[PDB]
Amino acid sequence: WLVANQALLLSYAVNIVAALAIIIVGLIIARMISNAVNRLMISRKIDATVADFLSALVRYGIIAFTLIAALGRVGVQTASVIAVLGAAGLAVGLALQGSLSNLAAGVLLVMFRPFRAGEYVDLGGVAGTVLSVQIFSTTMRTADGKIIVIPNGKIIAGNIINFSREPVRRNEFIIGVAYDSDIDQVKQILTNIIQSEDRILKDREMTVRLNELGASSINFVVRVWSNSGDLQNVYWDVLERIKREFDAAGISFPYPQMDVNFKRV
Amino acid sequence: WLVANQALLLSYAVNIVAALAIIIVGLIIARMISNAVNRLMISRKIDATVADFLSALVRYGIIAFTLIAALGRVGVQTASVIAVLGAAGLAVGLALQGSLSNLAAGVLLVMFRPFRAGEYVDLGGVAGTVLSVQIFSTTMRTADGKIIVIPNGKIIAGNIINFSREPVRRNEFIIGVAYDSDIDQVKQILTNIIQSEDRILKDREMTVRLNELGASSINFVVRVWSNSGDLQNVYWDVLERIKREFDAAGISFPYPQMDVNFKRV
Amino acid sequence: WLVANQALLLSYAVNIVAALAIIIVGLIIARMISNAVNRLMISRKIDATVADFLSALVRYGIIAFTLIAALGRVGVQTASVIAVLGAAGLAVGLALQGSLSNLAAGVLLVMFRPFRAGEYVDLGGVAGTVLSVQIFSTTMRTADGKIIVIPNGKIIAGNIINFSREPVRRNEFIIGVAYDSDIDQVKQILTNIIQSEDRILKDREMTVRLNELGASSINFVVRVWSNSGDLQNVYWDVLERIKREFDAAGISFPYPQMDVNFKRV
Amino acid sequence: WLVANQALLLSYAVNIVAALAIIIVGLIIARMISNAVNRLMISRKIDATVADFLSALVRYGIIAFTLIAALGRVGVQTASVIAVLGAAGLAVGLALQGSLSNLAAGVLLVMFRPFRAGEYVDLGGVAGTVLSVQIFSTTMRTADGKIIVIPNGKIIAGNIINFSREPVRRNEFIIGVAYDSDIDQVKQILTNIIQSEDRILKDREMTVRLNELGASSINFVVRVWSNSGDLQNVYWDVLERIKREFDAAGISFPYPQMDVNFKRV
Amino acid sequence: WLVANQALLLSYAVNIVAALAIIIVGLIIARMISNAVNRLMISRKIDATVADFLSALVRYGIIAFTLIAALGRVGVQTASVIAVLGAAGLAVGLALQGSLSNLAAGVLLVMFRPFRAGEYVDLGGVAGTVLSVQIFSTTMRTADGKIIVIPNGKIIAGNIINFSREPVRRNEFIIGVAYDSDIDQVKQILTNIIQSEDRILKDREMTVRLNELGASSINFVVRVWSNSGDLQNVYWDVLERIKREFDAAGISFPYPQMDVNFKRV
Amino acid sequence: WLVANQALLLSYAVNIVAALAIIIVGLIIARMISNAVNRLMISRKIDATVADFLSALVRYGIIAFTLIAALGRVGVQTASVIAVLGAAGLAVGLALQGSLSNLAAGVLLVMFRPFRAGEYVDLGGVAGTVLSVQIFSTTMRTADGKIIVIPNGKIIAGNIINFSREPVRRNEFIIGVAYDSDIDQVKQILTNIIQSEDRILKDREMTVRLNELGASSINFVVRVWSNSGDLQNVYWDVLERIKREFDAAGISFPYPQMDVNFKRV
Amino acid sequence: WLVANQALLLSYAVNIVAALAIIIVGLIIARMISNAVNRLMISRKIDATVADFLSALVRYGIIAFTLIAALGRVGVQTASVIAVLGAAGLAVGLALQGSLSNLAAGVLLVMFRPFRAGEYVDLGGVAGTVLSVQIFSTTMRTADGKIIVIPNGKIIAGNIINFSREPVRRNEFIIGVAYDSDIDQVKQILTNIIQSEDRILKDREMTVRLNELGASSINFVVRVWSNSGDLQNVYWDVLERIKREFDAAGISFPYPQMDVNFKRV
Ligand SMILES: CCCCCCCC/C=C\CCCCCCCC(=O)OC[C@H](COP(=O)(O)OCC[N+](C)(C)C)OC(=O)CCCCCCC/C=C\CCCCCCCC
Ligand SMILES: CCCCCCCC/C=C\CCCCCCCC(=O)OC[C@H](COP(=O)(O)OCC[N+](C)(C)C)OC(=O)CCCCCCC/C=C\CCCCCCCC
Ligand SMILES: CCCCCCCC/C=C\CCCCCCCC(=O)OC[C@H](COP(=O)(O)OCC[N+](C)(C)C)OC(=O)CCCCCCC/C=C\CCCCCCCC
């Protein structure tokens, strides 16, 4: 009988009063925090539907938190709701793995700087000048003139070749001449063409060596070092001069040779 | 003996009354929340069987929650049911990883805009004009006229080449002429053809250089910058004009040359 | 001594009575739920051994639940059994990841409809007409006549090219003619063949331009738009007419040309 | 002092008696369950060492469970043992992911039947007649005569082309004839050869169209529908008849043509 | 003041005595279990440093368990140590995923037997005779004579082609003859060569059909079934006999034919 | 009624006083730890916005910790907040997997040293001289002159070929001579060229053997060991000397031979 | 009022005294364990900064453990700190997955020995002699002379071909002779060359059979077994002897034959 010779009914009364207190302060704290986030988002920047589900999801989250806290305050065991809610949080955490990976990689590309804005690089077989580095992705304009947006988590997970870091780079040529050409003559013509060029650095190597005895031609290699801004112009100028002086000196560039053994008359 | 000189039977009575209370309010709250979700889904949009298992799964979920909460209120240890239920929730969370990944990537493609509707792009080797960006996927019509639906989580995880972002792009030509052709003559003909075209931008580079000494031809490169809407028309017009003026000036486009050494008479 | 001046033996007696109560109602609820699932599976649909392990696994699951709940009610700590049981549930949840992924993707392919039954599509390099979309997989008959069953989780994870969505598509031709052919003559013959075809749409583009100066031929491109049902017939008809009028007008389709420089007499 | 004016020593005595009770009933229940599993495995089927570690691992598992339950009954905190044991269970659950995935896929291949025993299929680039579908893998004999065992989790994760599902399939031919051949003559000869064959279905399409203007030959395509058992025989018969009637009608099958421009006398 | 009118100091005294009891029995049980594992490992098999860290890691594990159980018995909250220890156990469980996967696959390859010792198989593009199947890997000697050790988890995860399971296999030939050869003559010569061979099974198929009209040759196919031990010898014998009788009957094996159109005199 | 014949109101008063104490010492400890981290970051090194969100995230973390500790001290159940917070921590832990993997691999590349600064290596098909090894990545300059930044977690996960570790390496040549050349003459010329070179190590192997009977040439192999700094110079010198002495001794380097059977007069 | 008619203030006093006791013994045990690890690391082996962060991280870990144990002893709920700390431990556990995988694989490569030091093997397309097997990686010198460091977790995850395990291996030759050559003459010459070699094992197979009727040559195969140390020398000797005796017996090695049909006079 409930003749009240006990204090457990007092404990039950303070439990239901505490549950109603949790409900009403959860409602008003949800309202005030939604108002504060709504005030601090409009002043800074908003998208309409994005800020809508932002404030809505924060409000539903804090309402669900205070509702199951009030259910647990009464005496209802709420561990299944916490299990489903933790599984849903882990699902959202697996969903946002690539985005947060791009964000962490974007932080690392700002702290450590392998490349900066205006530096010709290569990011996994994609070459071009870096325009800007942002939090999720970098934009880079190629030599063709097209803009490529690459996420940061793929930038760091691969090699990042930087062309504009070292001021001195190397050209390489494969000059195929005929088998009947003199080795010393072709070598001294190529040496004169290399040493008569002022933008080829003389303190580095100036290799002119027979590299390969190919199918229809002996291939010479010539490797010269220039500044990184003069590289393509040195390539074009010395290639044109190689062609002009080999045509002037009688050295022939062979076609795809073939021997034919004639039969059946 | 049960002569009731104790209050633990009072505690057991309020436990079984509380368990029955949890059962009946779980039933009526399941009914009212199923009615409210049923009312708010018919007005907005429904598929028949989809809304059927939606309201059914929400109802079975809240019934299972209140049933094992009522079992735990009696004194039955329910941690194994919570373990299996959390494992099933983690299974469903691993199942919905790709869908929620596409949803998060679709949010990022609306906040950050690498591309918009009506902008010729390239999304992992798939080129075409973007029709619309949605929450799970984007539809884009190619130049061939076919519609391709690409999920957003694969859009962000790869490179996204944007052709219609930079207003000025570059053409490139590989003009192969014979070895006997004059370098200066071919170079000045190509320079006249480039400088006589009004849609080629004169403040950018106008490269006409000998690029390669190939197998049966010397390959010239000519690289010119045009507006992004005039690019293909400039390509076609100046290629036709290259062919006409090289035919008029005697410069030959060589066939695949070959040297034959005749033997065995 | 056990002279019973305490109520903890009363508590122990109600614990062992409660444990026996949990055991017997777990047995009879296992029997009644197995009977109800057995009755509701035979009426709807069954496979014999599949329904056998279905009802068997549900019965062993609820028996294991009530047995370790009764062990925990006595005072035996059962957290290790819950740890192994949660690990086994997570193992089964990792096992059913692909199947539930196919199920979720099959729900998304019914809500959002990129394709329907009877619509020629391409699902990751597999083309053919969709027969039916089911919960785990779609069946599609190719043009060759073979039936291909593709799981839905691989359909959504890749590109889904839809041919029968846009009513107007484009043909493309690479017509290789000889270097000696007149550009204007071949261009006006191709223009007459295009403009004399009634199933080629005249409000779209009708490109006939010199596209490429190839190895042994200049390649013209001609790109015309037709309805999606007339596309292959337009291709065949205008290709046959191109061959007939180029044979009638003296324009030659060249063979793989080659220049031979004869040596060694 | 231990003068026993308290009941906590009574509580400690019933705790150590309960711990000894847990130990001895864990021993005898381990013995009886090991005896029951040993009796039910010998009658059904056994491998010697496999059944050895099966009964051994079940016995060590239930002994470890009752030992740490008895340690927790005394008052020793056992949560670290439960943490290591749950980590080991999750390790074994990650180890058995592929096997249980093959088992779940084998259940799905028996409920849904894309293929049955004796049905020529293609399972990820592996073609052959299905012998039997089992719980972990399917065996299929190829046309070459070799037996291939494919796991089910790789069967469902890829495309499963079924050749023997549709009763009517299509042949396709690429008939390359010379440029000098008449289009109408070759087309009417191929039409007569197709319409004179009784196993080619006349209500389907009978395409005979010029498909491609290739390098050294114009390629005709002819596509005919036959029953799925007559397909290869129709292919062989009509290919032999194409060769015989093109040899009889003067239509030539060209060799790899080449134009040679003779120079250097 | 500590005038001892309470029993909580009695409770604290039995807690510190119980903690010291846990420490000393953890030490002596660690010593006895290390002695028992040390005695049962030396008799069976040991590696020196491997058994060293085995007994050492078991001893440090049981010492860490009893130390944090004794810390939790005093009143120090030890849940952070359990969190780090469970994370380390999950790290070791992720580390041993491939090894335990190979072990589970090795159990499945002994229960189910796709192959046994001395059976020519193909395990993911690796062919050879199986020497032995072990718990982590199988060793197989190829036809070249080299020993290849393949882990079991890669064996089951791929296709396992078994050559020595079916006793009857099929040979296939591509016999390319000239266009001028008679179809009936070549077909009856090949039929006589097939029917004059005693190790070719006559109840199976004996296909001799024109398969392909190739570039420079018509390709006949001949497919014959033999026993699995006579297969290569039948191949060699009937190929030599095909060459001898086609040389005797005037049928020519053509070279790579080519048509040359001579120009520029 | 609240006539205060109980001490639970005393317990509630000390709970709310303890909650306010937790709040105020959480505020001042957050302020002091933020001040201490702010003081110890400015002296050592800072980036502005990076140190901003560093101190901000530490402050919000300790404020959230003390707020939900104060909520749990009152009596509000906070296990859902801990579930969401642990899921967010696991999300951030999955996000930082690649970065911490690169950090652990960078520690292993400093403890174990497969390569050091100034040592020509190959890191997954990327060759060049190592400049420096850092905590997340190594920079290495190639022979071309470009700087490549490779993350450490990809360095250790693949092969790391080290060229500059062994002081003695081997050259290999494929010398193709004509079929009519004498084997003994070519072998003794190559042996004289090898034994007349002083930088070829004589205590190692000096192989000069006929390796291959190729399509148009017999290929000799010659394999010689030199020091690792003389390797390319030995290659170039002995290749030039091979060409000079084979031209002097009449041994011919053949072109791509071909037999032609003339038909159709 | 605090007139002290209760023992809960006594309980609070022993709680704050116990918290201070936990703090001071956590400090001195952190100091003593840091001193003991510092003493046992300097004697054995150290790197400076590595041992620095080792002792530092152990000290910060045990200080964080005793600080949050002392916070939980007071009454502050510390489950959020344990959630973040367990998430950070799981992050570090995912970071060290590859390193611990290499360590476990290195243990398996020492217990099971597929290869030892000084044994020519092939580890995933990388061949060479094993120098040493270590805990994280194996070093192996190739035949070229370069040192390759391969991690153990990639060694076990792939095939490991062992050349130096079986003492007897097999050579294989593809001898292409002309169509006009006699089959019996070439077969008996090859049989005499094989049977006149003493290092070819006579109890194994000595296959000399016509293998293939190729494009311009009939290819004979000859397969002989030798010891594993004589294999390359047998290859070279018998290949040179094949060339010498086929040149002496008039058997010709054909060039790439071609038939030419001359047209257009
Ligand atoms: C989406 C659904 C949203 C629904 C939100 C509704 C919020 C409801 C919040 C407050 C309204 C409560 C009105 C009835 C409560 C009056 C009874 C009472 O004054 O309470 C006294 C006893 C205390 O017992 P005690 O101190 O010995 O327990 C120990 C627990 N310690 C340790 C925390 C103290 O309380 C008891 O006996 C338990 C009495 C049973 C209370 C029945 C009301 C339960 C309401 C909903 C259940 C539906 C479940 C839905 C699925 C969720 C699964 C988790
Ligand atoms: C899919 C299956 C659906 C089944 C749903 C059925 C819902 C049943 C809900 C209510 C009906 C209960 C009727 C019997 C209860 C009367 C006994 C009683 O008035 O209760 C008093 C004692 C209290 O004890 P206490 O305060 O000292 O405990 C401390 C627990 N604290 C801390 C929460 C207070 O209760 C005890 O002694 C324990 C008495 C044992 C109660 C036996 C009835 C158990 C029903 C089903 C068990 C089947 C298990 C199925 C598998 C699930 C595994 C989890
Ligand atoms: C696959 C195996 C299937 C086996 C299923 C068998 C089901 C057995 C179920 C019932 C039979 C019980 C018969 C003996 C019980 C009579 C003793 C008794 O009347 O109980 C009174 C005391 C209560 O103590 P308390 O209220 O102060 O505790 C606080 C616990 N609170 C908070 C929940 C109240 O109980 C105690 O002292 C503890 C007395 C120790 C009971 C010994 C019987 C344990 C049976 C099996 C153990 C084997 C373990 C197998 C591995 C599983 C590891 C989890």
PDB file of C-alpha atoms in Angstrom, chain G residues 18-92:
ATOM      1  CA  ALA G  18      42.962   9.132  -2.323  1.00  0.00           C
ATOM      2  CA  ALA G  19      43.025  11.431  -5.362  1.00  0.00           C
ATOM      3  CA  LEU G  20      46.116  13.242  -4.069  1.00  0.00           C
ATOM      4  CA  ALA G  21      47.683   9.845  -3.336  1.00  0.00           C
ATOM      5  CA  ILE G  22      46.992   8.723  -6.924  1.00  0.00           C
ATOM      6  CA  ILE G  23      48.543  11.957  -8.241  1.00  0.00           C
ATOM      7  CA  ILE G  24      51.736  11.717  -6.193  1.00  0.00           C
ATOM      8  CA  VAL G  25      52.331   8.002  -6.754  1.00  0.00           C
ATOM      9  CA  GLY G  26      51.574   8.505 -10.444  1.00  0.00           C
ATOM     10  CA  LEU G  27      54.273  11.179 -10.512  1.00  0.00           C
ATOM     11  CA  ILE G  28      56.875   9.093  -8.699  1.00  0.00           C
ATOM     12  CA  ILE G  29      56.056   5.872 -10.602  1.00  0.00           C
ATOM     13  CA  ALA G  30      56.269   7.872 -13.850  1.00  0.00           C
ATOM     14  CA  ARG G  31      59.678   9.146 -12.726  1.00  0.00           C
ATOM     15  CA  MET G  32      60.942   5.694 -11.690  1.00  0.00           C
ATOM     16  CA  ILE G  33      59.678   3.920 -14.827  1.00  0.00           C
ATOM     17  CA  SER G  34      61.113   6.688 -17.020  1.00  0.00           C
ATOM     18  CA  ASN G  35      64.421   6.295 -15.155  1.00  0.00           C
ATOM     19  CA  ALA G  36      64.355   2.499 -15.573  1.00  0.00           C
ATOM     20  CA  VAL G  37      63.539   2.646 -19.299  1.00  0.00           C
ATOM     21  CA  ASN G  38      66.182   5.381 -19.710  1.00  0.00           C
ATOM     22  CA  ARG G  39      68.738   3.153 -17.970  1.00  0.00           C
ATOM     23  CA  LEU G  40      67.818   0.038 -19.965  1.00  0.00           C
ATOM     24  CA  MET G  41      67.856   1.837 -23.311  1.00  0.00           C
ATOM     25  CA  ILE G  42      71.269   3.564 -23.052  1.00  0.00           C
ATOM     26  CA  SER G  43      73.069   0.289 -22.292  1.00  0.00           C
ATOM     27  CA  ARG G  44      71.482  -1.685 -25.134  1.00  0.00           C
ATOM     28  CA  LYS G  45      71.122   0.758 -28.075  1.00  0.00           C
ATOM     29  CA  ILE G  46      69.742   4.267 -28.629  1.00  0.00           C
ATOM     30  CA  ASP G  47      69.073   6.813 -31.279  1.00  0.00           C
ATOM     31  CA  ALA G  48      69.012  10.244 -29.654  1.00  0.00           C
ATOM     32  CA  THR G  49      65.708  11.797 -30.731  1.00  0.00           C
ATOM     33  CA  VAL G  50      64.090   8.347 -31.062  1.00  0.00           C
ATOM     34  CA  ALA G  51      64.846   7.398 -27.457  1.00  0.00           C
ATOM     35  CA  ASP G  52      63.844  10.973 -26.548  1.00  0.00           C
ATOM     36  CA  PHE G  53      60.294  10.650 -27.854  1.00  0.00           C
ATOM     37  CA  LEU G  54      60.163   7.024 -26.645  1.00  0.00           C
ATOM     38  CA  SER G  55      60.735   7.942 -22.991  1.00  0.00           C
ATOM     39  CA  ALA G  56      58.727  11.149 -23.452  1.00  0.00           C
ATOM     40  CA  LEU G  57      55.684   9.369 -24.902  1.00  0.00           C
ATOM     41  CA  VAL G  58      55.800   6.678 -22.204  1.00  0.00           C
ATOM     42  CA  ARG G  59      56.002   9.406 -19.537  1.00  0.00           C
ATOM     43  CA  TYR G  60      53.149  11.467 -21.024  1.00  0.00           C
ATOM     44  CA  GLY G  61      51.073   8.299 -21.379  1.00  0.00           C
ATOM     45  CA  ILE G  62      51.448   7.229 -17.762  1.00  0.00           C
ATOM     46  CA  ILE G  63      50.909  10.831 -16.576  1.00  0.00           C
ATOM     47  CA  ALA G  64      47.697  11.111 -18.623  1.00  0.00           C
ATOM     48  CA  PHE G  65      46.575   7.741 -17.236  1.00  0.00           C
ATOM     49  CA  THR G  66      47.129   8.744 -13.613  1.00  0.00           C
ATOM     50  CA  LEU G  67      45.597  12.206 -14.161  1.00  0.00           C
ATOM     51  CA  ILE G  68      42.325  10.924 -15.537  1.00  0.00           C
ATOM     52  CA  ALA G  69      42.308   8.116 -12.962  1.00  0.00           C
ATOM     53  CA  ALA G  70      42.605  10.799 -10.276  1.00  0.00           C
ATOM     54  CA  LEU G  71      39.844  12.826 -11.940  1.00  0.00           C
ATOM     55  CA  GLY G  72      37.617   9.752 -11.953  1.00  0.00           C
ATOM     56  CA  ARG G  73      38.490   9.089  -8.319  1.00  0.00           C
ATOM     57  CA  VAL G  74      37.148  12.509  -7.288  1.00  0.00           C
ATOM     58  CA  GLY G  75      33.824  12.106  -9.083  1.00  0.00           C
ATOM     59  CA  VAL G  76      34.398  13.768 -12.431  1.00  0.00           C
ATOM     60  CA  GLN G  77      33.013  11.547 -15.172  1.00  0.00           C
ATOM     61  CA  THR G  78      35.914  10.844 -17.542  1.00  0.00           C
ATOM     62  CA  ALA G  79      34.297   8.665 -20.216  1.00  0.00           C
ATOM     63  CA  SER G  80      34.694  11.275 -22.974  1.00  0.00           C
ATOM     64  CA  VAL G  81      38.454  11.439 -22.403  1.00  0.00           C
ATOM     65  CA  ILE G  82      38.499   7.640 -22.601  1.00  0.00           C
ATOM     66  CA  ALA G  83      36.482   7.801 -25.843  1.00  0.00           C
ATOM     67  CA  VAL G  84      38.894  10.279 -27.474  1.00  0.00           C
ATOM     68  CA  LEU G  85      41.886   8.357 -26.108  1.00  0.00           C
ATOM     69  CA  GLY G  86      40.573   5.057 -27.459  1.00  0.00           C
ATOM     70  CA  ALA G  87      39.903   6.691 -30.823  1.00  0.00           C
ATOM     71  CA  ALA G  88      43.476   8.024 -30.863  1.00  0.00           C
ATOM     72  CA  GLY G  89      44.774   4.579 -29.935  1.00  0.00           C
ATOM     73  CA  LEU G  90      42.761   3.060 -32.775  1.00  0.00           C
ATOM     74  CA  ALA G  91      44.171   5.732 -35.108  1.00  0.00           C
ATOM     75  CA  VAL G  92      47.732   4.822 -34.094  1.00  0.00           C
TER      76      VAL G  92
END
